[PDB]
Structure formats: C-alpha cells, structure tokens
Amino acid sequence: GGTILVVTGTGTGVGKTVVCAALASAARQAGIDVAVCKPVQTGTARGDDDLAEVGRLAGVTQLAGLARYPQPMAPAAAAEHAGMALPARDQIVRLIADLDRPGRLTLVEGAGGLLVELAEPGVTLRDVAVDVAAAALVVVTADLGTLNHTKLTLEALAAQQVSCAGLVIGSWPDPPGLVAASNRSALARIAMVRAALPAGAASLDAGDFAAMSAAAFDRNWVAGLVG
Amino acid sequence: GGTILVVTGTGTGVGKTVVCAALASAARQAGIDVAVCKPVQTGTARGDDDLAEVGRLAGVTQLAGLARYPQPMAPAAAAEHAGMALPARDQIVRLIADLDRPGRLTLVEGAGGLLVELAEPGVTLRDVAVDVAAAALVVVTADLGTLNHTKLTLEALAAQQVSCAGLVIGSWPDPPGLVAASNRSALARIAMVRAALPAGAASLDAGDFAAMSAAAFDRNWVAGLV
Ligand SMILES: Nc1ccn([C@H]2C[C@H](O)[C@@H](COP(=O)(O)OP(=O)(O)OP(=O)(O)O)O2)c(=O)n1
Ligand SMILES: Nc1ccn([C@H]2C[C@H](O)[C@@H](COP(=O)(O)OP(=O)(O)OP(=O)(O)O)O2)c(=O)n1
Ligand SMILES: [Mg+2]
Ligand SMILES: [Mg+2]
Numbered sequence: 001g002g003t004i005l006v007v008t009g010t011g012t013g014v015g016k017t018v019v020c021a022a023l024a025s026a027a028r029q030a031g032i033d034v035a036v037c038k039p040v041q042t043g044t045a046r047g048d049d050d051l052a053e054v055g056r057l058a059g060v061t062q063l064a065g066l067a068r069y070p071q072p073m074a075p076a077a078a079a080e081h082a083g084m085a086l087p088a089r090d091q092i093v094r095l096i097a098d099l100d101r102p103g104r105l106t107l108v109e110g111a112g113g114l115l116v117e118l119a120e121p122g123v124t125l126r127d128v129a130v131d132v133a134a135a136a137l138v139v140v141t142a143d144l145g146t147l148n149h150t151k152l153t154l155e156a157l158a159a160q161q162v163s164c165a166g167l168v169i170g171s172w173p174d175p176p177g178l179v180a181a182s183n184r185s186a187l188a189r190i191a192m193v194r195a196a197l198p199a200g201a202a203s204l205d206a207g208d209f210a211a212m213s214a215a216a217f218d219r220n221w222v223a224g225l226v227g
Numbered sequence: 228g229g230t231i232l233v234v235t236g237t238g239t240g241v242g243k244t245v246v247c248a249a250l251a252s253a254a255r256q257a258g259i260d261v262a263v264c265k266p267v268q269t270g271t272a273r274g275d276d277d278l279a280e281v282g283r284l285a286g287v288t289q290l291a292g293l294a295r296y297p298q299p300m301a302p303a304a305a306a307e308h309a310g311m312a313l314p315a316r317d318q319i320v321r322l323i324a325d326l327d328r329p330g331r332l333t334l335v336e337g338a339g340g341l342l343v344e345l346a347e348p349g350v351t352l353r354d355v356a357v358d359v360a361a362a363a364l365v366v367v368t369a370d371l372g373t374l375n376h377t378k379l380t381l382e383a384l385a386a387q388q389v390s391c392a393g394l395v396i397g398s399w400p401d402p403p404g405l406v407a408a409s410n411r412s413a414l415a416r417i418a419m420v421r422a423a424l425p426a427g428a429a430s431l432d433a434g435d436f437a438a439m440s441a442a443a444f445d446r447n448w449v450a451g452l453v
Contacts, residue, residue: 011372011375011376012371012372012375013372071405072371073371073405073406073409074371074374074409074410074413076413077406077409077410077413112371112372112375113372113374113375113376113379114375114379115374115375115378115379115382116374116375117374144239144299144300144301144339145238145239145240145301145339145340147301147342147343148238148239148301148339148340148341148342148343149238149340149376149379151342152340152341152342152379152380152382152383153379155342155379155382155383155386156379156382159382159386178298178300178308179300179304182300182304182307182308183301183304186303186304
C-alpha cells in the first residue's frame with residue numbers, strides 16, 4: 001500500500017477541509033497521487049459537502065464518501081434525526097483500504113474533532129487511525145485557547161499510539177496579533193508545525209490556491225510522505 | 228481537611244468563573260463554608276478579576292490568588308510579555324492546601340482549559356489537582372463541538388487519575404435550539420450534568436444570582452460535597 005493521513009482538528013470549524021485541499025494540492029504538484037476521503041459527512045441539507053470543496057479548490061477527482069446526513073449536527077445526532085444509522089467501523093476502514101495504494105497519499109478528513117463518534121459504538125477517527133495504521137495531522141487555530149485544545153488532542157493521539165504527523169495552523173491572520181504570534185511560537189514547541197494557511201484561502205482561485213499551497217508546505221516534508 | 232474541587236473547562240470563556248460563583252452560592256445556602264482560589268489571573272489591564280466576581284455574586288470572602296498579569300493572554304504568554312515568571316508549583320499547591328479545612332468547600336479555578344501552564348515549569352491545573360487530591364468539575368458549553376471537547380478533557384483527567392465530579396453547562400441559551408438540546412442529552416451520556424446555567428447570569432445582582440444558583444443544582448449533591 002501507500003500512505004494514509006487522517007486530517008483531524010482541535011474542534012469543528014478549524015480549517016480541516018482547506019488543509020486537506022492545500023496538502024492534496026501541494027502533493028499533486030509533487031507528482032504524488034492523492035485521494036481524499038470523507039467517510040462521515042453531516043449537514044448536507046445546508047449544502048455542506050467537504051468532498052466537493054476539496055475538488056473545487058484542489059482539483060482532486062479521487063473523492064470518496066460513504067454516509068451523508070442532512071442536519072448539521074454530531075453524526076450520532078444527525079443520524080438519529082434522519083432515522084438512519086452510523087456506519088460500522090469496518091465500513092470506514094474498508095472505504096480507506098480500497099483507496100490505499102503504493103505511491104498514493106490518501107487524506108481522511110473526519111467529522112469535526114478527534115473524539116467525535118463516527119461509527120457505532122463510540123468508534124472515533126482515532127480508532128480508525130489505529131485500524132489503517134495512519135498518522136494523524138492535526139489542524140489548529142491561533143486563537144486563545146488553542147494550546148490547551150492541541151495538547152489535549154495530542155495526548156489523545158498518544159493513548160492509542162497514533163503518530164502525530166504534526167500540526168497545520170488552519171487560518172493564519174494577516175497581520176497576526178500578539179496572541180496569535182505567541183501561540184504560533186508556543187505550538188511550534190509542542191509539535192512540528194507543517195504550515196500556516198493564510199486566512200480566507202477558500203476564496204483564492206485554482207492557480208492562486210495552488211501557489212499558496214506549494215508555498216505553505218515544505219517540499220521535502222511532502223515528498224517524504226510517500227515513497 | 229475538607230473538600231477541594233478544581234473547576235476547569237473545555238476551553239476559555241465557557242463560564243468557569245460564574246460556575247465557581249453559582250456552586251459557591253449553592254453551598255453557602257446549604258450552610259457550607261466556601262473558599263475560591265484563583266492562583267493566576269491575566270487580563271488585569273482591562274479589569275479582569277474573576278475573584279471579585281465570585282465575591283459580588285456569591286458573597287465569598289475567602290478569595291485567594293497569587294499573581295495578576297495585565298495582558299489578556301494565557302498565563303505563560305502574559306508572563307513572558309510582562310517579564311516575570313509564573314508562580315512556582317509549591318506556591319499554588321500550598322495556597323490551596325492551607326485554604327482546605329474541614330467543613331469547607333474549596334473551589335480552585337484555573338485559566339482557560341485543563342492543560343494550560345499555570346506555574347513554572349509547565350505545571351498545569353491537572354498537576355495541581357493531583358497533588359491536592361482534588362476532583363475536577365468540568366464546565367462545558369452547549370454548542371456544536373462540546374462533545375469532542377468534553378471527551379478530550381475527561382480523558383486527560385482520568386489519565387492522571389483525577390476524578391471527575393461532573394459537568395456543568397457554563398451557559399444555557401434561550402431558546403435552546405437543536406444543537407444545544409441534543410447535546411444536553413449527549414453530554415449526560417458521558418458524565419453527570421449537575422447544572423446548566425442560564426445565559427446571562429453574570430449580569431445578575433447577588434440576590435437574584437443567589438436564587439438562580441439555589442435552583443440550578445441538586446440540593447442533595449451540593450450538601451454531599453462536604
Ligand atoms: N486558511 C483558511 C481556513 C479556513 N477557511 C474558511 C472555509 C470555511 O468556510 C471556514 C472553515 O474552514 P473548514 O470548513 O475547512 O474547516 P472544517 O473542515 O474543520 O469545518 P468542519 O470541522 O465542520 O468540517 O473558513 C479559509 O477560507 N481559509
Ligand atoms: N450562565 C452564564 C455563563 C457565562 N456568562 C458570561 C460572563 C462572561 O462575560 C462570559 C464569560 O464567562 P466566564 O467569565 O464565566 O467564563 P470563564 O471563566 O471560563 O472565562 P475565562 O476562561 O477567561 O476565565 O460569559 C453569563 O453571562 N451567564
Ligand atoms: Mg470540513
Ligand atoms: Mg474564570
């Protein structure tokens with residue numbers, strides 16, 4: 001097989017999809033095949049579709065989903081509202097596994113924060129990362145409160161020995177205020193910071209987003225992800 | 228000794244301070260003697276003072292603290308900016324332990340969430356809670372995300388074998404809404420929910436806040452703390 005990265009976050013809203021898209025973009029400009037996989041997707045009745053957005057921004061055509069719920073809630077709530085069920089654990093692993101392939105980077109965006117239930121019972125993205133032997137890349141903010149949330153997330157990745165690919169600062173303000181700059185230094189002491197995506201990048205166009213994306217990440221880190 | 232709860236949160240601004248007050252208000256009306264420690268305080272330039280708020284709202288007079296930094300940052304950043312180290316771990320633990328006496332409920336409030344550094348070098352609210360054999364009351368929000376955040380923190384806690392005395396929803400919104408009403412139920416599936424405090428209660432004067440706080444907790448559980 002190839003490489004699997006689950007792309008996680010300190011909470012919901014933190015920039016996960018833009019990161020999936022940015023790293024997928026950057027990898028494709030390294031000749032690296034990329035699939036992105038959104039196993040649980042809630043809030044589709046509000047037009048949320050994280051798979052479509054990665055394609056829309058990065059041009060990834062290898063987009064893989066499974067469950068979709070209408071209401072923008074926790075997947076257990078969104079399922080329970082629609083009368084539906086969550087996937088079983090093996091369905092999410094099977095979905096990633098068939099995507100897996102040597103020379104290919106498969107990114108797996110979960111639904112919100114690391115410990116959000118994704119499959120019955122209490123199965124989270126962290127359990128799924130164990131099953132497919134994936135490292136997790138953790139998307140963070142610069143806002144107040146982020147150091148605690150991150151530290152909590154990494155402590156959780158360690159309890160099941162899920163390696164940390166590092167952190168990406170999801171939205172980097174320009175200019176950064178005093179809190180933002182400090183936290184940027186503080187998180188760099190907590191883990192390798194892989195990139196800091198400039199705020200509002202979801203309004204850059206194809207070429208702009210790709211330029212931004214090639215800039216955001218270290219070439220040697222990206223190319224080192226798949227051999 | 229008596230009872231020491233640490234009052235932590237799944238983040239910042241979740242209502243840690245007014246839960247300290249509402250729990251303190253409820254204990255006093257149960258004839259319990261209450262003390263609130265808040266070792267570090269940032270944001271004092273714009274007038275941040277969580278201890279004064281507990282005093283106004285619950286009438287606590289045993290209100291202890293060790294430093295005050297002007298910047299509204301997380302302690303260690305606020306210290307770095309001032310040029311002045313955090314207090315030492317010993318200061319914090321022993322302040323809290325000298326507060327502890329039989330018949331008293333000693334609430335400890337940190338700064339932000341559980342893993343923020345409170346003292347040099349890197350000692351958190353969680354460390355403190357271990358050394359003084361305190362349990363954690365976890366203050367939570369009701370918004371989308373409360374769940375991942377609650378679960379992270381309850382884990383963190385149990386990792387160092389710091390018991391969880393429960394969850395309080397910092398602020399209940401009016402009217403709730405689909406997320407909040409769902410989460411209030413999902414939250415009860417991961418830990419006991421001891422209260423949910425109505426949004427906006429910080430603005431009450433002390434007579435009205437007292438009556439709110441009396442109603443917000445189960446009386447048996449309150450008295451059973453000490
Ligand atoms: N560098 C960035 C980061 C985020 N966004 C925008 C797009 C989104 O409207 C919002 C948040 O980004 P995401 O949707 O990608 O974050 P999440 O995937 O984490 O949301 P959710 O957790 O619900 O999936 O900010 C942006 O424009 N530029
Ligand atoms: N039932 C409630 C709960 C909270 N608040 C308000 C008061 C404050 O203006 C704001 C933030 O609340 P807290 O100060 O209680 O929150 P924290 O103590 O957790 O914030 P911090 O972590 O900065 O100390 O919420 C309110 O009015 N009514
Ligand atoms: Mg998303
Ligand atoms: Mg407070």
